[PDB]
Specification:
260 residues; globular; binds chloride ion; cytoplasm; cysteine-type deubiquitinase activity; wnt signaling pathway
């Protein structure tokens, strides 16, 4: 299929095309891209479907992969679908974009593709391979099923910890405080399973994504330009060894990729 992450263009050329006229909104977006352009020369437009946040994060993480992270080296990763689904039968309410084999196939693909990218000598070889992977075919969307499953697993672990009275990060309190997401089944049914053209990860779920792939996500939030949220980092205090990926969000729903 066609690329789902568009070929790069100059970031201020992009800004000048999208943001014209003298509205306060347009002025704030221009200031936002001007600030981003101090560190990144170019931008890649990410397909704005319900997977936009996952696509943006995974494309950055994988195109920048120089090693296979320990959580993907762990043999437990491939055992997780059978162990989780056997224990929590409501997971079979999963809606795909049997279940154990499908998820295991997706996780095996994620691990294999990531390992192959980490094997490459140059960033250019990685970008070519990523440009082939993110072409709107079944392999791309299988990656999102894998990551969504790891998000569900991390959510179950955080929920169970909070039940036991163990310390949990506060974003998980906020995640489960939502009336549509009071427990992991509601998270699955009402958020991870969601309907086309309406879904996408909410702010609190960006923390969950970061935890699931062990990446620090640095987001220029342009609708927050004149506030301390002009950047938000997910999670707030990650391990220093987690790799950093940078995104741009004009609103708190759609993400593009700055590149240099
Ligand atoms: Cl033009």
């Amino acid at each position: 299929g066609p690329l789902s992450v568009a070929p790069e263009m100059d970031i201020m050329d992009y800004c000048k095309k999208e943001w014209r006229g003298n509205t306060q909104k347009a002025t704030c977006m221009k200031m936002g891209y001007e600030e981003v352009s101090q560190k990144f020369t170019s931008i890649r437009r990410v397909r704005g479907d319900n997977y936009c946040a996952l696509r943006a994060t995974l494309f950055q993480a994988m195109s920048q992969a120089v090693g296979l992270p320990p959580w993907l080296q762990d043999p437990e990763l491939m055992l997780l679908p059978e162990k989780l689904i056997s224990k929590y039968n409501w997971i079979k309410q999963w809606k795909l974009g049997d279940l154990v084999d499908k998820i295991k196939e997706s996780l095996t693909l994620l691990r294999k593709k990531w390992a192959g990218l980490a094997e490459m000598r140059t960033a250019e070889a990685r970008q070519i391979a990523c440009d082939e992977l993110f072409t709107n075919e079944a392999e791309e969307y299988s990656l999102y099923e894998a990551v969504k499953f790891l998000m569900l697993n991390r959510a179950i672990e955080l929920y169970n910890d909070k039940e036991k009275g163990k310390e949990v990060p506060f974003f998980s309190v906020l995640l489960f405080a939502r009336d549509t997401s009071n427990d992991p089944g509601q998270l699955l049914r009402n958020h991870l399973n969601q309907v086309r053209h309406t879904g996408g990860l909410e702010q609190v779920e960006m923390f969950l994504l970061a935890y699931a792939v062990r990446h620090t996500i640095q987001v220029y939030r342009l609708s927050k330009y004149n506030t301390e949220e002009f950047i938000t980092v997910y999670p707030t205090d990650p391990p220093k060894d987690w790799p950093v990926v940078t995104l741009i969000a004009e609103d708190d729903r759609h993400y593009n990729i700055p590149v240099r």
